[PDB]
Design a protein around this nucleic acid. Structure first.
Ligand SMILES: [Mg+2]
Ligand SMILES: [Mg+2]
Ligand SMILES: [Mg+2]
Ligand SMILES: [Mg+2]
Ligand SMILES: [Mg+2]
Ligand SMILES: [Mg+2]
Ligand SMILES: [Mg+2]
Ligand SMILES: [Mg+2]
Ligand SMILES: [Mg+2]
Ligand SMILES: [Mg+2]
Ligand SMILES: [Mg+2]
Ligand SMILES: [Mg+2]
Ligand SMILES: [Mg+2]
Ligand SMILES: [Mg+2]
Ligand SMILES: [Mg+2]
Ligand SMILES: [Mg+2]
Ligand SMILES: [Mg+2]
Ligand SMILES: [Mg+2]
Ligand SMILES: [Mg+2]
Ligand SMILES: [Mg+2]
Ligand SMILES: [Mg+2]
Ligand SMILES: [Mg+2]
Ligand SMILES: [Mg+2]
Ligand SMILES: [Mg+2]
Ligand SMILES: [Mg+2]
Ligand SMILES: [Mg+2]
Ligand SMILES: [Mg+2]
Ligand SMILES: [Mg+2]
Ligand SMILES: [Mg+2]
Ligand SMILES: [Mg+2]
Ligand SMILES: [Mg+2]
Ligand SMILES: [Mg+2]
Ligand SMILES: [Mg+2]
Ligand SMILES: [Mg+2]
Ligand SMILES: [Mg+2]
Ligand SMILES: [Mg+2]
Ligand SMILES: [Mg+2]
Ligand SMILES: [Mg+2]
Ligand SMILES: [Mg+2]
Ligand SMILES: [Mg+2]
Ligand SMILES: [Mg+2]
Ligand SMILES: [Mg+2]
Ligand SMILES: [Mg+2]
Ligand SMILES: [Mg+2]
Ligand SMILES: [Mg+2]
Ligand SMILES: [Mg+2]
Ligand SMILES: [Mg+2]
Ligand SMILES: [Mg+2]
Ligand SMILES: [Mg+2]
Ligand SMILES: [Mg+2]
Ligand SMILES: [Mg+2]
Ligand SMILES: [Mg+2]
Ligand SMILES: [Mg+2]
Ligand SMILES: [Mg+2]
Ligand SMILES: [Mg+2]
Ligand SMILES: [Mg+2]
Ligand SMILES: [Mg+2]
Ligand SMILES: [Mg+2]
Ligand SMILES: [Mg+2]
Ligand SMILES: [Mg+2]
Ligand SMILES: [Mg+2]
Ligand SMILES: [Mg+2]
Ligand SMILES: [Mg+2]
Ligand SMILES: [Mg+2]
Ligand SMILES: [Mg+2]
Ligand SMILES: [Mg+2]
Ligand SMILES: [Mg+2]
Ligand SMILES: [Mg+2]
Ligand SMILES: [Mg+2]
Ligand SMILES: [Mg+2]
Ligand SMILES: [Mg+2]
Ligand SMILES: [Mg+2]
Ligand SMILES: [Mg+2]
Ligand SMILES: [Mg+2]
Ligand SMILES: [Mg+2]
Ligand SMILES: [Mg+2]
Ligand SMILES: [Mg+2]
Ligand SMILES: [Mg+2]
Ligand SMILES: [Mg+2]
Ligand SMILES: [Mg+2]
Ligand SMILES: [Mg+2]
Ligand SMILES: [Mg+2]
Ligand SMILES: [Mg+2]
Ligand SMILES: [Mg+2]
Ligand SMILES: [Mg+2]
Ligand SMILES: [Mg+2]
Ligand SMILES: [Mg+2]
Ligand SMILES: [Mg+2]
Ligand SMILES: [Mg+2]
Ligand SMILES: [Mg+2]
Ligand SMILES: [Mg+2]
Ligand SMILES: [Mg+2]
Ligand SMILES: [Mg+2]
Ligand SMILES: [Mg+2]
Ligand SMILES: [Mg+2]
Ligand SMILES: [Mg+2]
Ligand SMILES: [Mg+2]
Ligand SMILES: [Mg+2]
Ligand SMILES: [Mg+2]
Ligand SMILES: [Mg+2]
Ligand SMILES: [Mg+2]
Ligand SMILES: [Mg+2]
Ligand SMILES: [Mg+2]
Ligand SMILES: [Mg+2]
Ligand SMILES: [Mg+2]
Ligand SMILES: [Mg+2]
Ligand SMILES: [Mg+2]
Ligand SMILES: [Mg+2]
Ligand SMILES: [Mg+2]
Ligand SMILES: [Mg+2]
Ligand SMILES: [Mg+2]
Ligand SMILES: [Mg+2]
Ligand SMILES: [Mg+2]
Ligand SMILES: [Mg+2]
Ligand SMILES: [Mg+2]
Ligand SMILES: [Mg+2]
Ligand SMILES: [Mg+2]
Ligand SMILES: [Mg+2]
Ligand SMILES: [Mg+2]
Ligand SMILES: [Mg+2]
Ligand SMILES: [Mg+2]
Ligand SMILES: [Mg+2]
Ligand SMILES: [Mg+2]
Ligand SMILES: [Mg+2]
Ligand SMILES: [Mg+2]
Ligand SMILES: [Mg+2]
Ligand SMILES: [Mg+2]
Ligand SMILES: [Mg+2]
Ligand SMILES: [Mg+2]
Ligand SMILES: [Mg+2]
Ligand SMILES: [Mg+2]
Ligand SMILES: [Mg+2]
Ligand SMILES: [Mg+2]
Ligand SMILES: [Mg+2]
Ligand SMILES: [Mg+2]
Ligand SMILES: [Mg+2]
Ligand SMILES: [Mg+2]
Ligand SMILES: [Mg+2]
Ligand SMILES: [Mg+2]
Ligand SMILES: [Mg+2]
Ligand SMILES: [Mg+2]
Ligand SMILES: [Mg+2]
Ligand SMILES: [Mg+2]
Lengths: 109, 171, 72, 119
RNA sequence: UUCGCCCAUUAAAGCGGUACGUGAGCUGGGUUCAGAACGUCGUGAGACAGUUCGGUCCAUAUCCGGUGUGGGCGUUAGAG
RNA sequence: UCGGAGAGAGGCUCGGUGAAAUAGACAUGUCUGUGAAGAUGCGGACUACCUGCACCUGGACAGAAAGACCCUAUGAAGCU
RNA sequence: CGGUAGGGGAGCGUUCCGUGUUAGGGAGAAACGCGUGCGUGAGCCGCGUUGGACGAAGCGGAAGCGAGAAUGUCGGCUUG
RNA sequence: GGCCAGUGAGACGAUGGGGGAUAAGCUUCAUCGUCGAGAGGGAAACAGCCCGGAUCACCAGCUAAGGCCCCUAAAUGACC
RNA sequence: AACCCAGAGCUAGCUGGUUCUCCCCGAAAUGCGUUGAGGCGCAGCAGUUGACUGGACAUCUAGGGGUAAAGCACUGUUUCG
RNA sequence: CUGACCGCGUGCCUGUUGAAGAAUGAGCCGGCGACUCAUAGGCAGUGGCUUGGUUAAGGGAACCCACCGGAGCCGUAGCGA
RNA sequence: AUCCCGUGUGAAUCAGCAAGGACCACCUUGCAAGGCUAAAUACUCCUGGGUGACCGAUAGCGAAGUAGUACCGUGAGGGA
RNA sequence: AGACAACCUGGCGAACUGAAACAUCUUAGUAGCCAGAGGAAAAGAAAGCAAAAGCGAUUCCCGUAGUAGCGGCGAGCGAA
């Protein structure tokens, strides 16, 4: 008959993506039914919210043959880049803040 | 002395014309505004939140009943051995300046900081930690009598009947 | 006899200040219709939360005698 | 302490009015009108100090064009200028216009140099 | 009333635009103003894209525009 | 129909006395086009010596302040 | 280094008070009128075949402190 | 984070669409540009299209968009 | 529902007005709630002030998706055989 | 000072998505004419003390003001109805 | 609770009576149902002295002259 | 006996307003009116405070304190 009723969008959908980082407890996916299935290191909730048990990179996989599952793996972050563009410029900012602060009270006349 | 804004003189100056109220509407109108806690008619924050625990019913609010002093303050001050601490001698050296409510109050000693000296202390109460550290250091703790509670005779007969019972039992 | 500002009493039965100077309030919704609220919820609605920075203005403006650090 | 505005007004007004001397009609009389008229004057003035720089270039270019077109059947402003440049001369358009009116033989010479070299 | 009908003619009794072309040119209705009555709706005060009778719009033309009618000056000396 | 002539009071000229509403400034054409979508004032053409007087009322969204109609206001009042 | 709402910085001026019963002033003060003077500007500095007795600068203070709009308002004078 | 503002009527244009008649300079959303709050040039004139973002002086110069018969700056240029 | 005076400078989320100069920066016309719609509260986007920071503009890789296109495997629909 | 002729040049304000508007307002000129004061709260800038800071009313060679006046008030303990 | 009044009832005298924020016990404090009393505090139609970061004829009192006058209003009142 | 600016005491006693509407509440026991008396009036010599320690008629100021509280627990009111 007469229309015009509707609902606020429920904020569902993938919260963290593939090869990003997840805390423990952090929510990976809010879904209606299970469009994704829990893999390893990963808990499922009552509403089928999928959440992490472990710090690490989240990765999506083929549950097989059709469906998809998400799981979290621990990574290794050793490669801190000692001399590189990132480091170089950030260092530059530090050093410039220190310098430009030291030459203030360090002004004669 | 920073010179004041005089609004409504010229535009080149400052807030001219409108004066910095922008166009129209209620905020730009002369006169008393709307109440400071008032949001538009949506139920105000302060209303849609429940009243604080004890207050809400008329249970009397909590009030400090002692002037708390830690041992820190007593260390810092100029106390030589044998000196009497009390209440009075802490007004003397000014570490406590009590106001009306605090005037009428008693004193209490709270353990913090480690005292080095032998002092003679007079107060109406101590925390446990306090008198532990104090009797450890060799200080004499004089506890002052509170004002007597007036009890009618019958309840004396009761509370004494108790003591008689305990006494006849142990002996 | 001048005029001194009056504490808004209906806000001072609601908000208070912690020792370090931040404002807190109760949480809304435990008085009735409890049976149908899960116990986990009921627990969440029992604690004291720091007031949302946004409201601080209005709050502060109505409780002029409350000692409050906004952390400057 | 009461303060009459006194002369602070009429000085301002008078100093404005001095501006508007020789405006026809009520633009030289009424203060209120005079104000506006002052602003507009100052405004056009500013505008046409900018128009000016456009306009004399207009002019000069026109005069140059006429001065050259006398010589060859096929010769222009454009052709000329192009040749001034591929010959590396710096003379700008004010100067060629002024030498066009005030020393016409000179411009004939310049043209003869440009031709000889373009030959 | 736009519309339209008829009578008697007529060569024929065209259709449109111009802020209903035209209300500081004119006049009827219409904005159903206040009174009153009928039908109808409403307990009611009152109401009606119902009907009915009664019911105040002024104006010395500044400018443009116009219809006329002069003066001045021009028309390279002045005139008829 | 279909207007005509006449008499008085004005109008008109001369002398005396002498207002008013109005008014941003006005050196104040027409057509067409444009534009807050109907222009003396912007564009393009066209037409126009300067300035009176008597007449005319198409324009200047002419003039005489809250628009009676419609809506708003947590306005006002009367009435049920 | 465009700029409305709007925010910040830096200034000018008016009357009055302190310095002060100041410097100066019937050998012409304020004001009024003028400038080939100087300022980014508000303004300043200089000048008077006006005027006839007051009153700067500096360094500070205070406000009935700056007008073109209020169908503002009071006087004066036009237009018609 | 502190202190302390305005704004909460938007307009068209490009694109994706819904309502409407794949009507409206209509209406309502989404990602952008300009106007708002933007002068200059091109668009005859011409908020929203194109070029370009105006500290100021210059009677200097090179270009963008757009142009080169006359009004009106530049070719009454060349070759198909 | 008289008039005059007084409460009374009533009240007006409304309309009008709000006066010297220069310098720097500079929006919004959106969302939510509202006896709300031309008002207001908070958020969004100014300014000024501090505290932490290391980015931005580019370049490449990686994620999830179900639009354009496409398709008839399901759901409808449809023509003829 | 005047101004032959050429070029450019859509009053001001208000208020609007937007105006030269045929949108409002002003006949003209000169005056009068608007973010003020008291008291509190918050923040900033400057000082004074930090042997913590400060006095209120009150008293004062009339005022101002020297010198008093610690009653109060702010900061030194929180958690909890 | 304390305080003070309409209607109706209605005590006790110091071995009492009242008050101590419903009420009861205990303790403390006090003596209603008779009166009267200065100062410290409020004010300006005024009187006498004094001061003024108060006005200087649109200001200051409405009023520097017939000022509550002229004038207006039946009157209360308005009012240069 | 009448007159008498403000202040004062008693008697009657509002409404706009605020609460973003409004009725409890606010405005406010304010204005206004009436009566009365004075240079002041009123109040005033504990049937009072307080709390287990003490004060010693009334009035006025500072403070307690925007505290305890009151409150469509709203707007606000607000002690000792
Ligand atoms: Mg949905
Ligand atoms: Mg579970
Ligand atoms: Mg000020
Ligand atoms: Mg400023
Ligand atoms: Mg203005
Ligand atoms: Mg402001
Ligand atoms: Mg305005
Ligand atoms: Mg506003
Ligand atoms: Mg108001
Ligand atoms: Mg008020
Ligand atoms: Mg209030
Ligand atoms: Mg409750
Ligand atoms: Mg507490
Ligand atoms: Mg204290
Ligand atoms: Mg604390
Ligand atoms: Mg409960
Ligand atoms: Mg705020
Ligand atoms: Mg003066
Ligand atoms: Mg003034
Ligand atoms: Mg000239
Ligand atoms: Mg025929
Ligand atoms: Mg007709
Ligand atoms: Mg016709
Ligand atoms: Mg007409
Ligand atoms: Mg009729
Ligand atoms: Mg009936
Ligand atoms: Mg009749
Ligand atoms: Mg005429
Ligand atoms: Mg004519
Ligand atoms: Mg003629
Ligand atoms: Mg002639
Ligand atoms: Mg002639
Ligand atoms: Mg002649
Ligand atoms: Mg006739
Ligand atoms: Mg006749
Ligand atoms: Mg006659
Ligand atoms: Mg005559
Ligand atoms: Mg007149
Ligand atoms: Mg003409
Ligand atoms: Mg058009
Ligand atoms: Mg046209
Ligand atoms: Mg034209
Ligand atoms: Mg023109
Ligand atoms: Mg033009
Ligand atoms: Mg006409
Ligand atoms: Mg006529
Ligand atoms: Mg016009
Ligand atoms: Mg409403
Ligand atoms: Mg109402
Ligand atoms: Mg700028
Ligand atoms: Mg501004
Ligand atoms: Mg000066
Ligand atoms: Mg001077
Ligand atoms: Mg002076
Ligand atoms: Mg001297
Ligand atoms: Mg002189
Ligand atoms: Mg002087
Ligand atoms: Mg000077
Ligand atoms: Mg000076
Ligand atoms: Mg003399
Ligand atoms: Mg001086
Ligand atoms: Mg004033
Ligand atoms: Mg004026
Ligand atoms: Mg007048
Ligand atoms: Mg005349
Ligand atoms: Mg909204
Ligand atoms: Mg809207
Ligand atoms: Mg608006
Ligand atoms: Mg569009
Ligand atoms: Mg579109
Ligand atoms: Mg699509
Ligand atoms: Mg179609
Ligand atoms: Mg569409
Ligand atoms: Mg539209
Ligand atoms: Mg583009
Ligand atoms: Mg705007
Ligand atoms: Mg822009
Ligand atoms: Mg442009
Ligand atoms: Mg152009
Ligand atoms: Mg661009
Ligand atoms: Mg640039
Ligand atoms: Mg720039
Ligand atoms: Mg070139
Ligand atoms: Mg040419
Ligand atoms: Mg050709
Ligand atoms: Mg009436
Ligand atoms: Mg008022
Ligand atoms: Mg009132
Ligand atoms: Mg009202
Ligand atoms: Mg900028
Ligand atoms: Mg936008
Ligand atoms: Mg509204
Ligand atoms: Mg806001
Ligand atoms: Mg910002
Ligand atoms: Mg994919
Ligand atoms: Mg992909
Ligand atoms: Mg798929
Ligand atoms: Mg498709
Ligand atoms: Mg297909
Ligand atoms: Mg199929
Ligand atoms: Mg099929
Ligand atoms: Mg010209
Ligand atoms: Mg022209
Ligand atoms: Mg409009
Ligand atoms: Mg106009
Ligand atoms: Mg407009
Ligand atoms: Mg409009
Ligand atoms: Mg006016
Ligand atoms: Mg007008
Ligand atoms: Mg008028
Ligand atoms: Mg003023
Ligand atoms: Mg204000
Ligand atoms: Mg103040
Ligand atoms: Mg303050
Ligand atoms: Mg300090
Ligand atoms: Mg004192
Ligand atoms: Mg004294
Ligand atoms: Mg004194
Ligand atoms: Mg009693
Ligand atoms: Mg009591
Ligand atoms: Mg009573
Ligand atoms: Mg009785
Ligand atoms: Mg008896
Ligand atoms: Mg009793
Ligand atoms: Mg007693
Ligand atoms: Mg007795
Ligand atoms: Mg009694
Ligand atoms: Mg007695
Ligand atoms: Mg008595
Ligand atoms: Mg006079
Ligand atoms: Mg006078
Ligand atoms: Mg005079
Ligand atoms: Mg008498
Ligand atoms: Mg009498
Ligand atoms: Mg008497
Ligand atoms: Mg009421
Ligand atoms: Mg009422
Ligand atoms: Mg109300
Ligand atoms: Mg209201
Ligand atoms: Mg006395
Ligand atoms: Mg007495
Ligand atoms: Mg006695
Ligand atoms: Mg006695």
């Amino acid at each position: 008959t007469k229309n015009g009723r509707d609902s606020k969008g429920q904020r569902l959908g993938v919260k963290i993506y593939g090869d990003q980082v997840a805390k423990p407890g952090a929510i990976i996916i809010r879904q209606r039914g299970t469009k994704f299935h829990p893999g390893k290191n990963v808990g499922i909730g009552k509403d089928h919210t999928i959440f992490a048990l472990i710090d690490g990179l989240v990765k999506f996989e083929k549950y097989g043959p059709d469906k998809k599952k998400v799981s979290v793996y621990p990574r290794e972050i050793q490669p801190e880049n000692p001399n590189s563009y990132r480091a170089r410029k950030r260092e530059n900012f530090r050093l410039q803040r220190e310098k430009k602060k030291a030459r203030r009270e360090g002004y004669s006349f | 002395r920073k010179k004041g804004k005089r609004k409504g003189r010229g535009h080149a100056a400052g807030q001219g014309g409108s004066c910095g109220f922008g166009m129209r509407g209620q905020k730009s109108r002369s006169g008393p505004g709307i109440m400071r806690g008032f949001e538009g008619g949506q139920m105000p924050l302060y209303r849609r939140i429940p009243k604080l625990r004890g207050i809400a019913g008329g249970m009397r609010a909590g009030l400090p009943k002692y002037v708390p002093i830690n041992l820190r303050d007593i260390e810092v001050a100029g106390f030589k051995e044998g000196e009497e601490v009390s209440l009075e001698s802490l007004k003397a050296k000014g570490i406590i300046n009590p106001s009306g409510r605090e005037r009428r109050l008693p004193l209490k000693i709270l353990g913090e900081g480690e005292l080095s000296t032998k002092l003679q202390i007079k107060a109406r109460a101590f925390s446990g930690s306090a008198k532990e550290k104090l009797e450890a250091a060799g200080c004499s703790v004089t506890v002052l009598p509170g004002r007597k509670k007036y009890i009618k005779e019958s309840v004396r007969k009761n509370l004494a009947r108790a003591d008689e019972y305990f006494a006849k039992k142990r002996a | 006899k001048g005029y001194k500002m009056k504490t808004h009493k209906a806000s001072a039965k609601r908000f208070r200040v912690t020792g370090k100077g931040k404002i807190v309030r109760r949480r809304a919704g435990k008085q009735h219709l409890l049976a149908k609220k899960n116990t986990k919820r009921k627990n969440r609605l029992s604690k004291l939360i720091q007031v949302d920075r946004s409201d601080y203005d209005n709050v502060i403006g109505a409780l002029p005698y409350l000692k409050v650090n906004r952390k400057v | 302490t009461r303060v009459k505005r006194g002369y602070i007004a009429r000085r301002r007004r008078k100093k404005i009015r001095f501006f508007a001397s020789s405006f026809r009609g009520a633009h030289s009389r009424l203060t209120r009108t005079i104000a506006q008229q002052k602003i507009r004057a100052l405004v056009s003035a500013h505008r046409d100090r900018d128009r000016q720089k456009r306009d004399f270039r207009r002019l000069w270019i026109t005069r140059i064009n006429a001065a050259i077109r006398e010589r060859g059947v096929y010769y222009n402003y454009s052709k000329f200028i192009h040749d001034l440049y591929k010959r590396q001369l710096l003379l700008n358009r004010k100067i060629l216009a002024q030498i066009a009116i005030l020393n016409p033989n000179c411009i004939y010479m310049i043209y003869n140099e440009i031709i000889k070299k373009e030959d």
